[PDB]
Amino acid sequence: MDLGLKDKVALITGSSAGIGFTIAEKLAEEGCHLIICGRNSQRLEQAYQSLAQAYPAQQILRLVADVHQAQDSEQLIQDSLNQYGKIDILVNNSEGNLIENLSDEDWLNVFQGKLIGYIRLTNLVLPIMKKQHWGRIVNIILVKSGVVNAALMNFTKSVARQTAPYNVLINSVNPGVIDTPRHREYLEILIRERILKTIPMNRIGTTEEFANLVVFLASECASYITGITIPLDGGLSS
Amino acid sequence: MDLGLKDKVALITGSSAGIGFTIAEKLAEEGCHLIICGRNSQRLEQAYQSLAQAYPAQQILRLVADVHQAQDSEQLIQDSLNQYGKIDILVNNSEGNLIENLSDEDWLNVFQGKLIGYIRLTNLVLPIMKKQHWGRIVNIILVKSGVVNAALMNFTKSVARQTAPYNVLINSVNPGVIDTPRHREYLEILIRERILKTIPMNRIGTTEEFANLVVFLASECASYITGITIPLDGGLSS
Amino acid sequence: MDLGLKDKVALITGSSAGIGFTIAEKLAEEGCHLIICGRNSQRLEQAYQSLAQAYPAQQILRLVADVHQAQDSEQLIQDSLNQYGKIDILVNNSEGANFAENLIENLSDEDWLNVFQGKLIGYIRLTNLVLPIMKKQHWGRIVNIIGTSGKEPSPRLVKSGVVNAALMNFTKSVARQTAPYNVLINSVNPGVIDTPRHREYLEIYAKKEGTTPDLIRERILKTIPMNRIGTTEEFANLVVFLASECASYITGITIPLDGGLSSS
Amino acid sequence: MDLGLKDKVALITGSSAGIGFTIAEKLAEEGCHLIICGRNSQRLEQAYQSLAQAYPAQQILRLVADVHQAQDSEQLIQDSLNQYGKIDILVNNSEGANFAENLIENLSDEDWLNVFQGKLIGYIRLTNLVLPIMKKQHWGRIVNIIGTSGKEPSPRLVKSGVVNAALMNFTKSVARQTAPYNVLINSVNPGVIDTPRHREYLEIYAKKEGTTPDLIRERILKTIPMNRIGTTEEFANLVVFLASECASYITGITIPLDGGLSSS
Ligand SMILES: NC(=O)C1=CN([C@@H]2O[C@H](COP(=O)(O)OP(=O)(O)OC[C@H]3O[C@@H](n4cnc5c(N)ncnc54)[C@H](OP(=O)(O)O)[C@@H]3O)[C@@H](O)[C@H]2O)C=CC1
Ligand SMILES: NC(=O)C1=CN([C@@H]2O[C@H](COP(=O)(O)OP(=O)(O)OC[C@H]3O[C@@H](n4cnc5c(N)ncnc54)[C@H](OP(=O)(O)O)[C@@H]3O)[C@@H](O)[C@H]2O)C=CC1
C-alpha cells in the first residue's frame, strides 16, 4: 500500500527506544525524513546510528530534548522548522489508601508532564501544519495515568474538530501490552504468565505491530480519519 | 421514598445559588444538616436566611470559602468537622484558530481550578468518610471544560473503585441545560429558542429537577450505585 | 422524597419473582396501582397474594402472560387498559438469553432468531404498545431492565450482550422521539443482583466448571468493588426513582447499578 | 507499506458497487484473490468485468448471492472453498435497514424481524461460517462494515442504529473468542461515504422534506468537520489495513471512518 509519505517530515518524540523508535523506523521506511528526540543523548545517538545506517537516503535530525519542558519543546519545534522548512507529522510519545495519599503537588506535577506536554507540542505544530494544509498528529496514550489519558482523549476530539478544515488530522492510539524497554523493565521491577492470561491473544504485542497502525494514521491513506482513539491491545479492550 | 438521610451532614459547595442552592434545599428537606459555602458572602447570607427559614429544625453552617484555593478548602473541611463531628455527603460543585491560542499558563490555570478543586476536596473528605464507613460524593460535571470534565469522569471511576470497600460511593452528574443564574446570565451576554430546538424535551431543566437526582445519589437508597456518571439533560445525549 | 406516584398505573412485566417482583412492591409502596405478570400461574398467584396482603390499599391486577409473545403482549395491554383506562409506567423486565452455550460458531441462526424474538423484540413491542397511550396523556415512564453485558460483554453472555447493546441503542432513539411528550425512556443495567435467576446461574456454572456455587460467588465478589452482591431492593430503588415525577428531566440514558463493576 | 496480502483469499460481500466494490479493488491491488458477490446479476457482471480487466493477474470468482439468506450464504462459502480451498479474509458488507420510516410505534414486529433477519443475522451467520475455516489455519481477518448510528443513533436510523450497536457488541465477543487463533475481527463505521446508497438516500430525503439533494448534502457537510463527504477509496484503505498482516495485534474494536463526525 502506497502511503504517500515520500519526503514528509516526521517529528517522533521519545524515539530513542521502544515504540517511539520503531515508529521512526517505519516512517523512514515509507520515505519520511525524521526528527527523533529524547533526553538520553547516548541512547539517542545509538537510535540515530541504527536509523541512518538502515535508511541512508533519508534525512534524520536528532535533537536532545525533554518534551515535558516548555523551552526544550519550543526549541525542538523551531530547530525542526529551521532544518526542514516544514513539519508534516507529529507523534506525541512521552512518559506518563492510595488516592487520598496524593497531594496537590503530586497532581500538578503529572499535569505538567505528559498532559501539558502533548497539548503544548500540539499547539506548537498546529500553525505550521495549518499553513501547509497538511498535518497528522498521533498521540500515544494507573489512577494518575487514567485521568491524563482521559483528558488527552477528549483533547484529541476537540482539536481534531477544529483543525479538520485544514487537513490537519489528529488521532490517538492506545497501547495494550507492548514489548518495550520499560516493560522488560517494569516486570523485572513469570508474572508475564499472568499478563498473557489477560490478553485474549495470549501474547504481548511488538513495537512493529504498534507502529504499523501509527504510520497508517500518519499517512495520506488516512485522509478521512480524524478525532478517534484506537486501542492496539491484542484484544484487552474485549 | 425514605432516603435514610435524617441527620446526615452534607457539604454542598457553590450553594449560594443555582444548582448548588437547590441541592442544599432538597437535602435539608430529606433531613440533612448542611454546610453551604461560596465566596460571595452576601449571596451566601441570602441563601442561608432562605434555607434556615424554610428548614428551622435543621442545622446549617455557612462558610465563606473559595473551593479552588487549597487553604480555604482545608479550613472548609476542618471547620465542618469541628462543627458536626462528621461529614456524610460531599457535593462538589464549583465553576469550570482558538485551541493553538491557549498558552501553558492558560491550561495550568484551569487545572488548578475545578479539576484540582474536586480532586482535593475529595482527598480531604475521604479519610473522614472511610472512618464513618459511610460516604457519598457527587461531582457536578468548551475545549478546556471538556478536558477537565473527561479527567473528572475518569477520576470518579478510579476513586469509586478504591473506596467502595468502605461504603463511600462516588458518582457524577452531568447537567444539560439548567435554568441557573449563570444561564440567564450567559444568554444575556431568543437564542434560548435555538437551544430549546436542540433539547429533545423542548424545554430547559429546573434546578429542582437536577437536584432530585443528586439527592437520590446522596442517599441510602443508592447504596449499590457507584462509579458512574449520569447525564441529566432532557435528552441532549440522545 | 415525594416521588409523585400516588395513583399512577404501573405495569411491571416479569413481576412474579426477582427484580421485577421487588420493583412492583416498591411501586405499590409509593402509591401505584399495579399490573403484574408472569408465565407460571402458581408463582404469579404466590406473588399476587403477597402483594395484595402487603398493599391492600392498592389495586393490583395479575395476568398470566408471556411478554415474549405478541398475542399475550397485546392482550396484556388491553386487559390493563380495560381495568385502569390508562398506563403511566412500563418496566420492561423479562428473561434474556440462556446460559448454555457461548462458543459462537456453535450458535445457529435459530438460536439467534429466538434470542431476537425473546427479550429484544419483547421490550421493543411492548414499548410500541404503550407509547400512544402515554403520549395521548403527556405522561409516561418506561424503564428497560437490561444488563451490563450490553456495555461490557462477558464470556458467558455473547447473546445477551448483543441483545443488551441493541436495547441500549433503542432506548436512546425512542427517548429522542417521545421526549417532547413527557414520556421518558431509560434503562438500568444490573450488575449482579441476588435473584432466583442469579442463584440458578450459580448452581449450574458450578456444576459445569466442576466447583461449588459458593466459590463461583466468591469469584464474582472479588470483581465487584463493593465486595457484595446487590439486593433487589437496592435495584428497585433506582427503577422507582426513574419511574417517578422526580426524574422528569432524565431521558435516553442507561445506568449501571452494579456495585462498581463498571468502574473495574 | 507491505501488507502481506499476496495470495490471500478474500471474500467481500456486497462488492458489485459502493464501499464493497472499492474494497475489492484495493484488496486485489495488494495481491488478493477475490470472491465478490451481489444480488443483481447484471451489476455483478459489470463489477466482475471491471475487476477482471483491471487486475487480470488475480483470480476473481463472482457469485450471485443474497447474503441475507442462509442458503445462499452457506452456498457462497462452499463455492468459495471449492474454488480456493481456503478463505483468509471476510468483509461483512450488506444492506442495512431501509430509510422509509423512523417513527417508532409505527414499526411492527415484522419490520423489526426483517431488520434482524437482514444485515444483523447476515453478518453473524457468515461469521459463524468462516470461523472454523480461519481457525484451522490460524489466520483470519473479518471486517464488519457497520455504521456510526451504532454508536450515535440518528433520527433517520432507529433500526439501523439498533442493528449496528448489536453488531458492535458481537464484534467484541467474537474477537475475544477467536483471538488466540490469530483470527481477528474488527468493525468500521462509515460516517458519510459517497456511494450509490448515499446518493439514493439523498434523492429521496430531498423529495421527502421538499428540498433538493444538493441542500441535503450542504446540510450534511456542515456537520462533518472536514467539510466533505468521504470517498470509497478513503474508506477501503482502512478496511484493507485491518485485513492485513500489519494489523496483527488489533482485534475487537470498531473504528469510525467519518471525517470527524464522531468528534462533533
Ligand atoms: N509500553 C506500553 O505498553 C504502554 C505505553 N503507554 C504509553 O505509550 C508511550 C510509549 O511508552 P514506551 O515505549 O513503553 O516507553 P519507553 O520508556 O520504553 O520508551 C520511551 C521513549 O521515549 C523517550 N522519552 C521519555 N520521556 C521523554 C521526554 N520527557 N522527552 C523526550 N523523550 C522522552 C525515552 O528516551 P529518554 O528517556 O532518553 O527520553 C524512550 O526513547 C508512553 O507515553 C506510555 O505512557 C501506555 C500504556 C502501555
Ligand atoms: N448550569 C448548567 O447548565 C451547567 C453546569 N455545569 C456545571 O455545574 C456546576 C453548577 O453550575 P451553575 O449552578 O450553572 O453555576 P452558577 O454560577 O449559577 O452557580 C454557582 C454557585 O457556586 C458558587 N461558586 C462558584 N465558584 C465557587 C468557588 N470557587 N468556591 C466556592 N463557591 C463557588 C457560586 O457562588 P460564589 O460565586 O459566591 O462562590 C454559586 O452559588 C458548575 O460546576 C458547572 O461547571 C456544567 C454544564 C452545564
Ligand SMILES: NC(=O)C1=CN([C@@H]2O[C@H](COP(=O)(O)OP(=O)(O)OC[C@H]3O[C@@H](n4cnc5c(N)ncnc54)[C@H](OP(=O)(O)O)[C@@H]3O)[C@@H](O)[C@H]2O)C=CC1
Ligand atoms: N439478576 C441479575 O443479576 C441480572 C439480571 N439481568 C436482567 O434483569 C431482568 C430480571 O432478571 P431476574 O430478576 O434476575 O430474573 P428472575 O428469573 O429471578 O425473575 C424473572 C421474573 O420474570 C418473569 N419472566 C421471565 N420471563 C418472562 C416473560 N417472557 N414473560 C413474563 N414473565 C417473565 C419470571 O416468571 P416466569 O418465569 O414464571 O414468567 C420471574 O417472575 C432480566 O431481564 C435479566 O436478563 C441482567 C443481568 C444481571
Ligand SMILES: NC(=O)C1=CN([C@@H]2O[C@H](COP(=O)(O)OP(=O)(O)OC[C@H]3O[C@@H](n4cnc5c(N)ncnc54)[C@H](OP(=O)(O)O)[C@@H]3O)[C@@H](O)[C@H]2O)C=CC1
Ligand atoms: N455509504 C455510507 O455512507 C454508509 C454505509 N453504511 C454501511 O456500509 C455498507 C455499504 O454501503 P454502501 O456501499 O453505501 O451501499 P451501496 O448500496 O452503494 O453498495 C452496496 C453493495 O452491496 C450489494 N448488496 C447489498 N445487500 C446485499 C446482500 N444482501 N447480498 C449481497 N449483496 C448485497 C449491492 O448490490 P445488490 O443490491 O445488487 O446486491 C451493492 O453492490 C452497508 O452495510 C451500509 O449499511 C453505513 C453508514 C453510512
Ligand SMILES: O=C(O)C(=O)Cc1ccc(O)cc1
Ligand atoms: O449480561 C447481562 O447483563 C444480562 O442481561 C444477562 C444476565 C441475566 C441474569 C443474570 O443473573 C446474569 C446475566
Ligand SMILES: O=C(O)C(=O)Cc1ccc(O)cc1
Ligand atoms: O447509520 C448507519 O451508519 C447505517 O448503517 C445506515 C446507513 C447506510 C447507508 C447510508 O448512506 C446511510 C446510513
